[model samples]
Target: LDPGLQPGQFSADEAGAQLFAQSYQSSAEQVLFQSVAASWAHDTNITAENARRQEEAALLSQEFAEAWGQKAKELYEPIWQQFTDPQLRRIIGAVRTLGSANLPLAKRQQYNALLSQMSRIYSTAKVCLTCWSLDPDLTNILASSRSYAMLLFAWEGWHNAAGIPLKPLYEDFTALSNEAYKQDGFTDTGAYWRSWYNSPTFEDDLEHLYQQLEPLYLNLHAFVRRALHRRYGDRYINLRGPIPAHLLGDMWAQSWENIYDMVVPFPDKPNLDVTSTMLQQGWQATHMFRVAEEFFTSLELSPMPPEFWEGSMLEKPADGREVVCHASAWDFYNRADFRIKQCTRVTMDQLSTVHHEMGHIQYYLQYKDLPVSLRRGANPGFHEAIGDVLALSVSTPEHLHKIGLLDRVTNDTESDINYLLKMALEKIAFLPFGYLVDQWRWGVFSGRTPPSRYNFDWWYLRTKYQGICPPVTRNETHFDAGAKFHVPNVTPYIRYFVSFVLQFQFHEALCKEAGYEGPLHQCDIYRSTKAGAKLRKVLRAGSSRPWQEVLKDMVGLDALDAQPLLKYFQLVTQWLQEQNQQNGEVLGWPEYQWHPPLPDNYP
Candidate 1:
């Protein structure tokens, strides 16, 4: 990989060349993080100490690279910046931005230690299902359990373990992050994350996108609220709006599809949950994934080359080896060795997840040949949407039966609403949530949200933006926000909100390419060479071009719009409205209020 020269290169600067190789080797090590990360996901507590040590080591390696990158920019940029090669200029420019975090080694070390402490807390924190220490069993129960008391108990319990432990550490994290951001020429950590978009108007632009989608989210919220009222009785479940957090399917209430049975528009139709059928037929984790592979090659996409089948971990070990079961796909950067790791369950949800993760493997295969820097989704949203775009198509009743997951299918209005409602429960329900996590973080980073009122502010934003609330009363007793993974890990969440919109946009575009008419929800792009060709073109470019430019290449649209999403779910949008009118359901929630006064300065 070295470029030219025998000896005495740059006056035989051993230290400089060594720095270059160290950064290269550092990134290579990062690529190999997959195995370690896979095992960590298997056993959370078992991996916490190793996880912390690994990150600190990566940081110490990154510290030198950051300093070196900045130094390299100083030495080489004046010539290259004005060079005739636009591609080279772009490549160097990205590198220059990477080099911006110019902190002393001591400060970098301090930051690394602080980050390690916060990450360890996030990794190891878990509540008991009984007297035994727990893992994602609590989270899985949250998704599957229906009991009102247990839902509240489990929800409170996990948040108690993860959230309260994070408050002081998070506060310290915010302080140090700001200090680091300043050295990096950022206004704050919030601004630093936003910089990835390469736009100043990015935050405001999302607001514009939100306004476009808010009506659909609000309508879906109202419909689900009434649906919930029927389940647990009116002891709670405000008929007007604002669904209780624990009542929803997911631990975070971000996805409500499990309660699809409860909110299902037409019960007379064939049920869509396939967990029973899969189990009755004796499907194991390998069988489910093998079927998922067949679906991909149906589109003429690349197969899971030999190494993938041999190397991937498809199920939790029976020998009691601790393993994280959360689903993830891995790209080894070797161009041919893509893999997926998940402890899969035999369920409709996991089936959709199988397609989604495989979609990731496909995209990885497409871009694996590109320069490492360019081997990413055109945007973060684009990356996530790739998998879900496939899910949207795969979940169609028509496609389900064709794949033999469903016995028969129907296209009547009732069936359409039933399918659309389930999709909305997860898809549309996530819109405001995607926007609001970073909304909270940005406020925190900018000091707009005060520390003492952290819990109040968190729930306030939740109720106001998402029409949802905590099932139990929460005070500033803990950092409840830390209960979410992205918060402690500091991953930007707005991308997911964007991904929801983009997946629909991608779906709609692919359907058009496949020559589909009728509702967007009913279109399936399976086995369409034209659709695969269009998708492949976009995947090949990766991040070599601006996302907007790449997006237009993929969808013939230069802007990220939610209109396609609304159009996709328009049937349910109208159905929810009609149902709400017939049932006297409220369209929106009452205003949010917190009686306990906070610092006058708090937002």
Candidate 2:
């Protein structure tokens, strides 16, 4: 029988209420209570089956978003709240909470279908190549290639593919989102996203955080600008002005921290190429995953069950079926099943990403016992930060040695600078961009940014926040923001900004527990049972308590701050200042000292 089409006979009414109320009765009346129990059981069973089908459809196909959209329209169109059973209502409410957009059923389904189509487009779309033959993918070209022209071509090509074609789609999304926001009782989508947390002053908290981190980001961006000016000369970047967007070594320019090795070549130390080493050692995807599994085992976490391996799509299928190569960790119906979908190439980045994804898996394992409502991180940021926190420790030179990836560690100034530069480009550089994505979207969703100014406002924000300019002349007609996966898919990005700061905070707390006492940046908590317990306590608490309460278990405080990040990167910051000063250049942009005057479209 169709669950949505279930007759009105079983609905919560006076008769049904009375049926549930009469728990005890004569022998002849036992069937009365039995019917109530059976009806509730049926509802629960239908929900569980629906949930499994949803997850399975997604697991089997990379285009599962599209599949799920079609299924949702058919299976969930009716109002689930029609069921009067308290337990059933509670379950439905949880689902409604997650999908809080206020659109009517028909509109919501339309939006879902649109987003799914956009997601599939974003997933399968590749940069079109017409010139020289090379790996046109942004990841490969940015990480491996040294040619400036080639990087520029690949970078521009990617944005071109992701932008122009999706402009109309993105414009439609903005309209739908706004309507949904109004319908759902929120003034705007920004308010809707901010409402996820239970805090009264969440907006104020985020503003204060950005203010605290502003100087650090500015200094880092300035230092990179100075370095690039020295390497590429005045044509690429003037010493006094903003950095060009394309030169930052990422398509989005969110994480330029990785470009240090490429831009500021580390000639003194051997190249840190984990991929070549793994290939030489004949390591397969399974072996690479085992490395990540052992990380949890050392911390005394539960091992991944055989079901994880059996269910996961760990690598690109040998028989290609247009699967999305981008990696993600999945938890279905509060950890009834968990799996990671990744292309899993044998590379250092992939290894770190595996550790990151497994962090999500570990989090799911810890919280699975909790009620569905509570099976979550203190906040989305907390969940995203856990694996990254471990990755920070894992990527350290010392931990690399212990893991057999490094034979010996180099302990020189250049080596330290090399590591620091690499980290700063990726982590520090990401801070402002991470904060600004949703910042732009909030404007669009709130009707502050008109569709005509989409590209203009996007670049304006990028330049304002990240100090990056378009490599080529860009105009308002393009949807450069849509070039990013999150924009098209409508995933919130503030969580990433939150995670970047929290990861460092977590790293410091864990290091202290592991008995680390050297330069703060060099501390690694590998194999430390004390640190593991601290992390486990926080993760296991799930969302049963407030986030602040859970945070207290690990960091001894509930607040979010950037002091840990500033402290961790202090050495690199100091070194960059000295290097810039020595080269007769400033350490930061002077204009960045004051916030830019707000434009009319500012949110």
Candidate 3:
């Protein structure tokens, strides 16, 4: 558009057009292009040399941001007028808005450096138990370990060891982030959250969705509390006091569902030990991923290209450099260059995780033809929810048997209750905790929460939303929420809560398209091209439309509600109520005089 013009010589309108054209072209050819190349280099040979190269690429991108930001600074008002497409306008507006901020360069560099350091630490952090390198075996501990001491030690060690030293760094990160927001015409850091949605009432809608889901969470929490109390007895679990959080299986107590075998095992039937079956059948971790891929292919979705398998990091690096152990799927701005970075293991949960990651892969592939600016899920939650929907469906008993993952089982009352309890703990119990994490962060970003009240407010929300509390006394000195990666990493967490709710909604809708004629929970879309076509229609739309519009296309509704979730879990909810009420369990913590004393400086 202005090939001969020098950087400083272009008119405002000319600069805007050039910027738009350049953005589209560079994104089409180089940015995601370079990202894919760097990811390929890092995944193929994770080394200091490769990491440095990737870092350089990132720095170059940062340089581009700064250069363009200066241009936008000179002519933001004029440049904003050039966009015809609303999507393009929003993209340019955001860049101009965020980049034109008056953040001090010194503070920005400090923010960048701190972020880079944290990234390295997270990349290399490893957990060691007495004889085990707990890094590769975290699932084995959380899902299979029966020893309370062992579970507690692993959970606490992983979080405290990695997070405690960085607590002050996270504080700095939070401050800088808030300042950046304030300078960019935002009242607080919550602007980033609001930016994710197009809805005017996004915050109100989110709050409403949480309240809508609260009753189901309360019922499930009460049932699980009673079950744990009975299993461990009053000595271990106080009837009138909070249930010990660590005993709930997950470190975060986000999903007590995993502890099904220990707390709510079927009367005479064993919990579905899919892990044992995978092990006995000699199923490799890659097989689990392949099966996940097969599920997608059966739905007539695009197959994984050859480069995906060749370039992917499917296992831990043998070179032993500290590398991030988190499982993630990467799309190198192109469909064919997709990769999954994971330390794969032959566990049922890992299989589900693989499915979850591949859900991302499939979504990426479906939208590869879109402009890079538009190549994202309808919303972050929609992206996160897609794979989980597949996991939920495949994890069901009927689907498991059909897929040869398990032998045929009698769908008796006892078995149904067991399966439902398992799901309730994982999916149902997670709703409030997921909602509260972001809720806490929103409070922090909006200045509703200050440093002194960090722990107090955390526990307050935990008890209020999750029906959970600290197993021991907590004080202002503790930063328990920071232990989770997203908190320190400054990623918006409401995506997860939204994903948890929306996955069931997606699942129910997909089931209907698949022509399933049974209970909502038992419907499987595997090998159903009709369901797949429906899903792909939504996936391929990318962010070209509002999320509600995309959601409407999938579910025949233009709202995110709890009705689908309640419908999917109806039978289990009925059973849980009967079991809990008959056993004299209350819907929340029973009244007790043993409240932990609040600090004198409590906010």
Candidate 4:
């Protein structure tokens, strides 16, 4: 509420101050963009345009009085050099070849470039603003953080337009982390395997997604502050409240307008990009043995059942000759095919995720023999939902115990409660970090700095919130190229979250079928009883119909609620308490925890 300034000072040199503000703003804006970027700000095509406009508006209002930040070496570091607009454009060019959502490369590249550049310009600019705030470290931190959040939302907004749920994507990541630690009874000892949860391929995928995302986010940040500073002096700019009410409304209206505008296929290049991209992704990884023929023979491949429910159980190829790859990159395809090796968390769920991807394959194969005129793929979430439904089922205590991967007693009722609690906490913990990564990328893309310091910025945030005190020291250059915000393909991965919601809803129906049941065990097994059979029917339908109706038919439920999940969390917290009490270990609850341990000081 306070400008922390003497009154009437802005009036005397307000014009001169405004002139200087506009001059600096123009200088900052023109130094990199070569022009005023009004086109990107008002493109009428997507959020990129909105973000551009928003950032410019915000930046205009950023004045020296509000920014005690010095242009110091650490703050104005050249970390962002390598990943700037030009470099990012090149990266996009590479991924464009892989195609996104099945669009043709040649036909869509122009539109894609326009969209890509617009987003990067807005977000990365903001990051630079924050990074430039060298005096009060918190100024840069807060500014960069907000910019990152917005860019991530922009990415998610696109995915939401496509009806993908990103929440479960977050959930599964946490679950995988839990699964690894649960193996060791939730202790930190022998966490190498859990550390392997940080596999490089997962990082590889994310790196590809973030590199482009970084600049976009940071640029947007800068543009906003500059715009705000222009119309209002630093006095007025610094006094602005949370995100500016008008800008948000503008963003909402603009997103819907752009979605409406871009809803159709290109008249000239229909079916051109998607099909080619599919072929590239599909053929590249088609043969597992091709690259690792020698190493493969030493490893065991315990594949899951082909189908989740009854009616359509197709056998995987007998010779392990499985055609199970699909194409969909959130940003772009693998242009360099560069390999990123690291122990990323996504690897923990590899067993089931791979299976889920193959579910799409099964659907394709089932109708493969049919002609193109009759051939069609299932609805978006239905395919993903089906695979996830089955994956969630198999990850349960009953199933894992039956398969001998878990101790039946430890992972049963008592153990499952503890497991569920840990899983819930992990999900909550990852939300901010996940959102922060997107924020950091936004900062980078928006022209916050050069790319050489990409790792430094990432590690800084990673340590601050993620409690990654000893944040990753190594560059693992390729993966860190831009892992924080890049989303592969042209879609944001948000729908997976909603899909997980629907998934649990579907599981409830299956659990109902196993009649010899008491109150449903939320985080445990959904036995394949009569209810499971009904669910199986839905799974068998296999994207043949809309996912909404399919879920309604299977679950017979009206909407989604996390009550089951929350109740499960309660029980798990209780279990954790008992475990600690039994071990006689004093509690050491971390400040970031949601609940103090059920009884043993778990904060």
Candidate 5:
């Protein structure tokens, strides 16, 4: 039910009711189509279809105006009703009380309910996955709004938790949090901070902090799933084995070959495998930093900025102050062409994070001059998926050999053997865990366990599926215990699991183009060289197009399937070959009867 005054003068039985539904859907389609058309108009670098951008834009302008008014009238009023300021106050109070060093389980349950209630409300507003496939920026804007909220949550709450006066602690926490986004790392996790999350009962002031911070979070699942199904759902096979891995290897070879194919000279070889890894890793690493740092770093600083001076101490704000999460961030933006408040971290996943964030900034930079409604990057999930392709391309051994990132292979045969093994380990372990989180959380929110017992149930799921046993403790926090920033932020970001599975479609397409029949690395290197440049122009053209068309434009095909992922799983299942040949007694090898899923379209 809409839960409030229904649209128009029509009830369900009225003839007008059906007209309204049709009108709503039609308007949605127009906006979706216009989003992509508009994208094509601006970015000339890409080879796009001869679609009518203005025709769709006209539809969008008319539909958006009429529909926009109703959104605030009916939707906002009812939605806001469920989220009263005082109720938020109680929610915050309960969470803080639980955070206190000696709080009881009853307090925790009270606070937890607030979180669940908030999540359910937010989920209702989540843009439809299909809508995202049509108009990509819808999701990006939504996601960015959520992230902004998360940052705000931290900003609003840091001061009282530190027990200091408002000024200094607020400045420090603002500085440190901004630093984390800009590329600076987290400061010492000092006793005070750890104690905050670990507290038995929180103070009154801390409760106030929670109230202010509750609205700023979002998750990445819905976007990821939309893109996955858009690109790879067609030829999907539910089967398993190394067949998917090989299929992915082939996609890489083909996508690379399609771009380079004798365009760049020398040995005429295509290093699609290596290029795919690098592109994807680079994308992953970019996320580790804030957007600004990502943009600036892509310029590859010479000596970098002085703000990131070695050993600058970061701290929380004092007791009370104007502590917005992006206070310093706003200042930095206002202060410099490329400001110093920019922060980021270089972790083990740095390469991938860097690429991902940069991919986002790249889209923003390209489309900044467009209208505000048009300023957003297209489908965040699609952008992320293509980015994965780029990162994966660069991570391969063959490309690394050329780029001098990895040592030269002493024996091609052995390196090929090793590559297959390394690839399998990455997915089989991670994908299932992603699924576990999604299912377990769904169960948690749906009364599978009372609020007081939720954490224990969470831990059991992790122990059983993730193969990691947590120490027994009455107090539970973190994902193992039940509370995760992701749950409250958004419910469906596990869509990445599916996206990870679908990226292999592009991988196989690339492999085929590279003219490699067997091992991917065997492709013509020269033909593979142009892959990056072409990808930048073609697939990276932003959310200007619906995800479906984007796939057709980039992959040069309409249909993709998930067989490649299942094939990879199957091959990993046969790890017995690698284990039996040597290291048969390895302690960590899984003993479960883990048969891989069937492949839908392995290559």
Candidate 6:
């Protein structure tokens, strides 16, 4: 039912429509972003009382967006069909597709509240056996321990806690939300998610993009498999079979950087884990951020504002507050208000994460003046890619040495292998996982994945893409996907896959901007305002135009290309291929299946 707007009210005048759209949109953001976002930030970062308040704020925000969207749509609808000014059309057309719009206000609120519960469960759910704590204990054992039994307990316990609990809610979430996307003129939520790319061939593009990287992943996988075979021997790993998932360092096995200790190519040399230096320096959490601020300021990007230093939560609160330990950056939608909420750790991961989070704040600084609709990344991946692109330069040995974090910068071939291999373990190992998370979720959203086949299809894709299998047998009863945070959090994951590719392109482009002649591994963007100037232009362009337009403007690539990433890692491929040749243990994995219960060694 249309609201009571007569036809041709604006007489196909695009300027009138544009002005109205901007006002209505600012009203929309003022209602949603200021109140709901502030409430949610408090809910995530601080008081228990804020949780109840945040839910109420969320309901009001959804109600407001619903009311506002319908009125705007009614006034703009006839004009939209009559004259499609690309600028005015996009601005107005976007209102209809606001997340959780088109449902009755109460239904929209309920749907959103359920999603909050799914994410909360992922954050707070506990696993038994050794008594879990995700922050210190679970992450510690999964990260540092080599014990097979310990890893099995943690991985299996996590799945039972978070994964099984979310299936019913996830099923309900999909069913309830399909109507929203349908109302917005999408085939389903999967189509809606794909619509962000503005390309009918997004799925095809992804397949093409991955084909370019699969060879690198396969070589890295084969070499790592050989290393694991030697470490665990005939009893635990198979030369031809998928490696057990639990044995990988991270609980999700999304990034295997934690296993660098076991897989370190030249272990006898000085430990490549920079966290060792980070720890020995006795620098607190604030120091990590200060250094990150320095890296960005070196690029002539926004330095942390004076308020940012005081306003941010740098570490777990000393007053025994229950805070979200997950590190994240925030944009308060006010020009001056940007912050990071991190329960910081003295680890290389956290150190790199500091740059990544700051990477986001800088972009927020660049685009705060735009109308709220245009302030977001051109695509979600742009935000993710920019954050990570900084980390590529910030983490380079050349940059680290210049910052006095590394004892010396090593440029020799052996150190290069170690550095490149470390990057491969984290970046390349993550590619399949980054792609598979969404594919599985998309399948579930479209009903292509049935409830009965949840765990079965889950492992099916896991093995097909990531070459990792469950350490213990899994039944259809388990809902393993929810064990990973993003599934329950409803966060799109393909951005990570896209980010990794786009970032290498960004790094290569920015390096050339900085007039670097060295190999990709040695290229660093520290203090090169030329690179910074380019990023300023890219971020300030915001989502005002199609992402490809910006992509071409920045990298001279017409689309999200994977070639720059391969070009960055070309030397590593040559090295990894040679290592695989020595072991000669074949590439890829055999099919995955259930495993035997833990050995009866009677601990």
Best by TM-score: 6
> How many steric clashes between backbone atoms does each model show?
3, 4, 2, 112, 123, 0
How close is each model in CA RMSD to the real structure?
Answer: 5.3, 9.2, 4.5, 26.5, 21.6, 2.9
Can you tell me which runs of candidate 3 are displaced by over 4 Å? 1-19, 27-29, 33-55, 69-84, 97-104, 123-134, 137-139, 269-271, 590-603
lDDT of 6 by residue, 273-321 (tens): 8888887889789998988888788888888898688678888777755
Candidate 4, 1-603: lDDT as tens digits: 124311122222224333332333333323223212332233222354454564443332222212311121122223323333432222222212211212223423333343444234322222242132111222223222323234333322322322122222322322333333343333321232212222334334444434423332222222332344454344323222212211211221111111111111122221111222324445222232121221111112112222221212122223422121122111001111111111111112333434455444434434433222122233344445555555555555554555434443342454444344323322323332443454454444333523455555655554343332211123413223222222321233323433444455655565555443544443333333454446445544543344445556766753344444344344544544554456442332132212111112211
Q: Candidate 1 lDDT, tens digit per residue, 1-603?
A: 122211112211334434443454345434445434443443333355665555555454455346545655655545655645454445445555542245566666666666666666665666664432233466567777877776776777878888898888788778777876776567888888887676768888899999988888888888777777777676666665467777787878888888887888789997877677888878888887877788678777888899899888887556755444557788766666677877777788888788889878888888886655567778778877887888888788888898677897687988888888888887888888899999899989888886887887888788888887776667798788998877876678988988888898899889999999878888888889889888988888877788888888778888888789878888888888887888876688873442211223322
Q: What would the TM-scores of all predictions be? A: 0.88, 0.80, 0.89, 0.35, 0.41, 0.94
Q: What is the lDDT of residue 157 in candidate 5?
A: 25
Tens digit per residue, CA lDDT, model 2, 172-216: 777787775565467877788876666888768888888977777
Selected candidate, larger lDDT, 1 vs 4: 1
Candidate scoring better on lDDT of 3 and 6: 6
What is the alpha-carbon lDDT of model 1 when measured against the actual structure? 0.73
C-alpha lDDT of all candidate models, in order: 0.73, 0.68, 0.72, 0.33, 0.34, 0.79
Question: Which run of 10 residues does model 6 get worst, by summed lDDT?
Answer: 1-10
Q: With candidate 1 superimposed using the best TM-score fit, by how many Å does residue 261's alpha carbon deviate from the native?
A: 0.8
For candidate 4, the per-residue lDDT at 535 reads 44
Worst 10 residues of 1 by lDDT: 1-10
Q: Model 2, which residues run further than 4 Å from truth?
A: 4-102, 130-136, 263-266, 269-276, 410-414, 587-603
Model 2 score (lDDT):
0.68
> What lDDT tens digits, residue by residue, belong to model 5 across residues 47-145?
112223433343344335334334333333233334334323222222122111122334323333333333222222222323221011222232223
The number of clashing residue pairs in model 6 is: 0
